[PDB]
Amino acid sequence: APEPRVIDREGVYEISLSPTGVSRVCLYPGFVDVKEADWILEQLCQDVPWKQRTGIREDITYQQPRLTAWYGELPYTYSRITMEPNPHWHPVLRTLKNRIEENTGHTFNSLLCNLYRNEKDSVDWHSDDEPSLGRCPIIASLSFGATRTFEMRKKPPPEENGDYTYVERVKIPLDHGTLLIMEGATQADWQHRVPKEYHSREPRVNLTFRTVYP
């Protein structure tokens, strides 16, 4: 089994060129300085209306191993009743939205907040390929609190018979205040997850900004 590549330096990485196109990730460690990130984490922990929700795999439901809240536009196929998106952005979240946009040149209209309570909270392998994100969505990820690992694995071609054993893999540590951008063919050609850990972890808040189209 090949060895996962590690991305942990500020930079811009074309992680693949095919089959759909160039998949690109950009890493910005310390996008938010630690002390400001400490204050932001406090605010979001006190104010975001975190709730336990269910997810779907294979038309069966389950309690997601994370708490969530939504702001702005919601992907068309999700349930507004279940996800309860707030069209009025928390002022702190609005600031971070504006700061990402001013520093990267990308716009967003949707925010998913994820609270990983501890080392047993996680998100399983997936792509951000909801239809209303379009082909090649630009997705910005901002992390606060405990470091957790963002893993990626390349979607195998058909001749691989659905085996992920030998696909290319990337590992990215996401620490306090780090911004990560995915763009290009990344949702098309890759999956990603945040795995559970077998060692004590304090809380982590992740902000995933996206653009939902009508």
Ligand X SMILES: O=C(O)CCC(=O)C(=O)O
User: By CB under 5 A, what part of segment 104-143 binds Mn ion?
Assistant: 128
28 is in an annotated binding site: no
Of Cl ion, Mn ion, ligand X, none, which one does residue 194 interact with (CB within 5 to 8 Å by kind)?
A: ligand X
Question: Under the criterion CB under 5 A, does residue 128 sit at the interface with Cl ion?
Answer: no
Number of residues that this document lists for the chain: 214
Alpha-carbon span 31 to 26, nearest angstrom = 12
Site string for Mn ion, 70-89 (x = CB under 5 A): --------------------
Question: Under the criterion CB under 5 A, does residue 168 sit at the interface with Mn ion?
Answer: no
Q: Shortest approach of ligand X to residue 159 CB, angstroms?
A: 28
Alpha-carbon span 101 to 97, nearest angstrom = 6
Question: Under the criterion CB under 5 A, does residue 37 sit at the interface with Cl ion?
Answer: no
Residue 66 CB neighbours (<10 A): 21
One of 38, 101, 119, 124 touching Cl ion (CB under 5 A)? 124
Using CA atoms, how far residue 206 sits from 36, 147, 174, in Å, is 16, 11, 9
Question: Which is closer to Mn ion, CB of 43 or CB of 127?
Answer: 127
Burial class (CB in 10 A: 0-12, 13-18, 19+), 204: buried
Question: Under the criterion CB under 5 A, does residue 151 sit at the interface with Mn ion?
Answer: no
Contact 173, 8 (CB under 8 A): yes
Q: Would you tell me which residues interact with Cl ion (CB under 5 A)?
A: 123-124
